[PDB]
Design a protein around this ligand. Sequence first.
Ligand SMILES: [Mg+2]
Ligand SMILES: [Mg+2]
Ligand SMILES: [Mg+2]
Ligand SMILES: [Mg+2]
Ligand SMILES: [Mg+2]
Ligand SMILES: [Mg+2]
Ligand SMILES: [Mg+2]
Ligand SMILES: [Mg+2]
Ligand SMILES: [Mg+2]
Ligand SMILES: [Mg+2]
Ligand SMILES: [Mg+2]
Ligand SMILES: [Mg+2]
Ligand SMILES: [Mg+2]
Ligand SMILES: [Mg+2]
Ligand SMILES: [Mg+2]
Ligand SMILES: [Mg+2]
Ligand SMILES: [Mg+2]
Ligand SMILES: [Mg+2]
Ligand SMILES: [Mg+2]
Ligand SMILES: [Mg+2]
Ligand SMILES: [Mg+2]
Ligand SMILES: [Mg+2]
Ligand SMILES: [Mg+2]
Ligand SMILES: [Mg+2]
Ligand SMILES: [Mg+2]
Ligand SMILES: [Mg+2]
Ligand SMILES: [Mg+2]
Ligand SMILES: [Mg+2]
Ligand SMILES: [Mg+2]
Ligand SMILES: [Mg+2]
Ligand SMILES: [Mg+2]
Ligand SMILES: [Mg+2]
Ligand SMILES: [Mg+2]
Ligand SMILES: [Mg+2]
Ligand SMILES: [Mg+2]
Ligand SMILES: [Zn+2]
Lengths: 108, 306, 148, 59, 152
Amino acid sequence: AAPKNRRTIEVNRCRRRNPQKLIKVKNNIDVCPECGHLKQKHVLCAYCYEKVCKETAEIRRQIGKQEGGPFKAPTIETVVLYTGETPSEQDQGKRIIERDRKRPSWFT
Amino acid sequence: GKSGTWWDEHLSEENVPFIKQLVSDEDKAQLASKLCPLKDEPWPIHPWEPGSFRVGLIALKLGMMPLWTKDGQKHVVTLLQVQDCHVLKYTSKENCNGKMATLSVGGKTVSRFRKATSILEFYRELGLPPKQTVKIFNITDNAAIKPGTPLYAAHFRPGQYVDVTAKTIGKGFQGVMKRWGFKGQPATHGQTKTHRRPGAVATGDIGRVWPGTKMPGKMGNIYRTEYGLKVWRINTKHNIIYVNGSVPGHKNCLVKVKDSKLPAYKDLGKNLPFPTYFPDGDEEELPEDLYDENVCQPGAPSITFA
Amino acid sequence: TARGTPSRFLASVLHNGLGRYVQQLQRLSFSVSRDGASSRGAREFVEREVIDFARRNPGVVIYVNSRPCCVPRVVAEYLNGAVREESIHCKSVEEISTLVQKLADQSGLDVIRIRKPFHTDNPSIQGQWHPFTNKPTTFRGLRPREVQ
Amino acid sequence: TMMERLHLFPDEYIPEDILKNLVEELPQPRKIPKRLDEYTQEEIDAFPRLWTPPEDYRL
Amino acid sequence: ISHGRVFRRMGLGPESRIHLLRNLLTGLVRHERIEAPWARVDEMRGYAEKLIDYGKLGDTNERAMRMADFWLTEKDLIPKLFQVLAPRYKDQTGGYTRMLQIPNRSLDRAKMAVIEYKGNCLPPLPLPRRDSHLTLLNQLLQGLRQDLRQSQ
RNA sequence: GCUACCUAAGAACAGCUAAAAGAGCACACCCGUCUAUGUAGCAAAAUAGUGGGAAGAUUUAUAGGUAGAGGCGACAAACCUA
RNA sequence: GUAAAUUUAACUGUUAGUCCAAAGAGGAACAGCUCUUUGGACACUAGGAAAAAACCUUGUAGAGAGAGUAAAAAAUUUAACA
RNA sequence: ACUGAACUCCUCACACCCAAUUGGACCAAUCUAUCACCCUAUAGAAGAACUAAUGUUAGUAUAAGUAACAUGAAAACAUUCU
RNA sequence: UCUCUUACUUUUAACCAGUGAAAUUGACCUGCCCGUGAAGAGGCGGGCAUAACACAGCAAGACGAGAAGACCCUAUGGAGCU
RNA sequence: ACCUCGAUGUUGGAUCAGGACAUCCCGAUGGUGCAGCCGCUAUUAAAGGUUCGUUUGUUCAACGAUUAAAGUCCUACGUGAUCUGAGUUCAGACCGGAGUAAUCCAGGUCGGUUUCUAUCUACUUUCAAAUUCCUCCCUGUACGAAAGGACAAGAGAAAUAAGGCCUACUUCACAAAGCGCCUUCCCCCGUAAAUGAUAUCAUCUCAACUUAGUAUUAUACCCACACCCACCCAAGAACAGGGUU
Ligand SMILES: [Mg+2]
Ligand SMILES: [Mg+2]
Ligand SMILES: [Mg+2]
Ligand SMILES: [Mg+2]
Ligand SMILES: [Mg+2]
Ligand SMILES: [Mg+2]
Ligand SMILES: [Mg+2]
Ligand SMILES: [Mg+2]
Ligand SMILES: [Mg+2]
Ligand SMILES: [Mg+2]
Ligand SMILES: [Mg+2]
Ligand SMILES: [Mg+2]
Ligand SMILES: [Mg+2]
Ligand SMILES: [Mg+2]
Ligand SMILES: [Mg+2]
Ligand SMILES: [Mg+2]
Ligand SMILES: [Mg+2]
Ligand SMILES: [Mg+2]
Ligand SMILES: [Mg+2]
Ligand SMILES: [Mg+2]
Ligand SMILES: [Mg+2]
Ligand SMILES: [Mg+2]
Ligand SMILES: [Mg+2]
Ligand SMILES: [Mg+2]
Ligand SMILES: [Mg+2]
Ligand SMILES: [Mg+2]
Ligand SMILES: [Mg+2]
Ligand SMILES: [Mg+2]
Ligand SMILES: [Mg+2]
Ligand SMILES: [Mg+2]
Ligand SMILES: [Mg+2]
Ligand SMILES: [Mg+2]
Ligand SMILES: [Mg+2]
Ligand SMILES: [Mg+2]
Ligand SMILES: [Mg+2]
Ligand SMILES: [Zn+2]
């Protein structure tokens, strides 16, 4: 199948500029209650998720440092501790991962 | 500008079960308030004339079930359950078409938090929780019923014929073989990429294709009306109707059921309760199950021929 | 073509014929080349006829610039402010005299489509037509099918 | 648009607004040929009797 | 026509779908928090809950041992499953595998999400908090609740 | 340097039945009977399935020779750089 | 009545044509069929028969918001009997 | 009785509506000789004029943001898994 | 294979992100019926229909596209063969 | 030989059919060399239907078993940008024949590439008001001389076509389907007859009029303007739609 005549610019502008093809304005965007970095509703804020993913990567780095090589996977629960912060009397049998930092004021 | 919002966006954690409990007790009390229509202020009840039309109901397709008759054959019944049925508004004869008056009827109950503003104002002036569907029943004016009265499944009696209507099961954009029942081309005798095509669609002279041509396209989400279904059995406790045969639409949809329009069943309506069956003014409780005289009951002597 | 060009209505500039008529041309700017075969007709015109034309109608001002130019021109500015410039490159004396006489005659309105060539300003005298002309009245203004 | 400007009605009844807008009821083209019961008997006396039937005829 | 058809088709067949969910579930049991596309984490949450149920069934049961031997492909996570996760969830029945969306992947712009087992000694996710009780609408509804309870 | 033919000196052909065999089934390999995909394709002739030969008139690497009024040809007027 | 005809010097171009009325020939006293003769039209403008080459009116060129004309619209309705 | 043309009249001016072919009057760009000096004149000359040859070259359109094209999963980005 | 097809998986396909062709194209503000016409009309006559714009299918039409028909004829155009 | 050789793809066949009636049947009427059943012919009527196989490539054609019927024709001898190439239109070869030969045959045979990603028009649920056969009673009656054998009325069963459904059966299983289940409602006009004139009888009336005679001025689906991030769905390509108490 072939074109029989060349489409004009009027037909083309009537096609590629109608409200079915235009980018729709969205209004789900508000500010995050902490740090104000323009989150979306129903979606975790990218800045705070970047914070907790960086700290999770650091904790997993120290965990991989404690577990030698592969296939260890300890049979007891874990807790992490920052500078100071002595092991409490419930955290006896749990494995201790201490990096070196202050405990940040959102991880309780 | 204005963002979108819903009912539980800005509530706290403590207020949501209180709000749910409050509105649930509120509309349950509203549904229990209209339980006695004959002692409120009922519209005048008229006797049955030979040329009249009564209102129908709105039921819910539960499922299907077998049912045997006294002569041994098997019939299949569809369980229609009337959950919460209420007449909504009465439009007089001169305001719709000048021919026949109408009655509005509402279906099963839904949430107030998901309806429009004008619908919520309408039901707030009426005094009922909102309904899922609203259908229109053409009646003559000697059978006008007060809006806000309840409708029950004993509106029909065992031995009658009803017409049921719903949205059928949608099958999407279906090809021409499953839609219009065409035959395709043969499978393996040399055919090249033509196993399910429609083939020719028009002749060679006309240079176009006619408007009524059957082609691919969406199929199955459209109202169809099933006519002349016998009603075998009435269950009064759970408000279940037992029509005969199949009913269009998937289970747990909503159907619109009224007495038949077929000319063979023209004036059989004299022995049916005509404004509507009323649970108050009967002065006698109906049994839990009403049967036709030909359907074999559950507790039965297990028929032996002779 | 008329659809591809602008248009005006027929009108006088400042109601000439009612009171006194005035010559609608102000200036005539002649640029004649000293040497040059392109302006020989304008040369002979400036020699013999422009003085008699200037004495013919004293309302117009005539300038002869006598400038070295390859194409001699005559610039005519009218009373209402329009400017019409036409060329006298390689023309005779008679054609130049006819051109400047035709410039002196016309008024400064634009030479475009004239669009209904009459300009009555009180077109009606006995009273312009309205649909109740030639329609008789009836007793007490009763419409058809009226009761009182 | 010209057909939208036209208002037709099946019987003598016209709505109140369209009766309020009316001017100049137009004459009719045809003459309504005036059946015999309405002939205002002096006119029947004016038109002459053209023929004498025989007295012994039964019709 | 897919009326009532659960289990979206993921891989290059059924077997590759179950192998993909097996690898995602093994990563979840090992790392306790996982980021992966949205349909995959939906299926993997649906499987992980009943995996925790089979872990709750007990260690000596051979059927739970066979299911844990199939679903964990590193063979060290089976003592973890029977001695860490299932004793941790001894009180709860099914409230775990908390799943939240994270905005978009950078390359192909796919809808990503994050699931995690509860407990989870990792730092917490920035969970979406319900609006506070001290705001205007909540205080008006608190007044209404107190007034109606006093009226009752 | 593809292809038709020839020359010099080389290389390859698992396993079973081996009747002795230009023997049989069947690998590697050579060829392309039928079907389906593809037709601006992976490909200016392919892919997948199904096929014939596969110890001999077999296949193939290297170098050389036969050239257009011709070369070559188990004659297809087949091939001689799409 | 008119103003054109003959000759002289110099060349190109047309020379594969259609329809209509009439006299014909072939064919079926068929064809928008073939071939001559006489005339007209087209391959030049405009108006008309519905759009239409060949049917009718009309030719020598423009502006006009004047006028008089040419050709120019299809009419028909019917079976008694001594 | 009327409507109804480029036919005719009316005011003005009048060379200004045919294929192939023929005759005649002008004319842009360029160079040269002589003039001219905000782009012109008189003569000679010619690679002297493009809405069209499936014309050549170069740019950009339509088809069209269409056909088609990719990266196995987790993660400490050490490793592990299918 | 069929009477008589159905369900499932993958590729394909639809939506989001990136890169991003080709044949074709006089201009198109691109409807239907009847009639007409170089004899088969979207562009003509008479009627009918008619707010605008995408997205996904179908192939009845555009005497649709790629090959200056390979069937037939002509050329005082070629060539093979006897 | 009037468009078409800077290409209108050719016969049948598969799917889809539209239309005309000069009607095969189902409907209704006249005549009959119509005693009944079958028949023949004429008028009206196109809403509906018009089978499965063998051989030859066949459209044609011959035969077997059925059915109320296996209708004629047109639609570019309908439809190849939907499909096949069975012969029919090349390059190989064989047989019979013509020709010294190269070559050929409106003679036969074996084999022989079917390319396109839809630009424009038109179209993509018109929501619904079905048809026919068969069985029983009548009846073994009407009818002959006997064979044979009816209409009309009533009752029951199916098949086709359309619209839907999953409770039993089956492919299969939190679904989709048939091999399964349920429903399907009004006519159609050619004539057969009263009274009665032109023409004091008679006469059905392109005389005024009266009956069969008109189904319909037919009823059921669908008809609430804006809460919309997000989730689910028996809803769905995207969009849109239903629920979130
Ligand atoms: Mg099939
Ligand atoms: Mg193919
Ligand atoms: Mg196939
Ligand atoms: Mg995939
Ligand atoms: Mg061998
Ligand atoms: Mg073969
Ligand atoms: Mg072998
Ligand atoms: Mg040979
Ligand atoms: Mg001829
Ligand atoms: Mg003249
Ligand atoms: Mg040139
Ligand atoms: Mg150019
Ligand atoms: Mg081309
Ligand atoms: Mg060109
Ligand atoms: Mg894209
Ligand atoms: Mg496209
Ligand atoms: Mg694609
Ligand atoms: Mg036509
Ligand atoms: Mg065209
Ligand atoms: Mg073509
Ligand atoms: Mg040619
Ligand atoms: Mg010759
Ligand atoms: Mg020659
Ligand atoms: Mg020669
Ligand atoms: Mg030679
Ligand atoms: Mg041709
Ligand atoms: Mg062409
Ligand atoms: Mg007939
Ligand atoms: Mg067959
Ligand atoms: Mg054909
Ligand atoms: Mg076609
Ligand atoms: Mg094809
Ligand atoms: Mg041959
Ligand atoms: Mg489209
Ligand atoms: Mg078009
Ligand atoms: Zn934040």
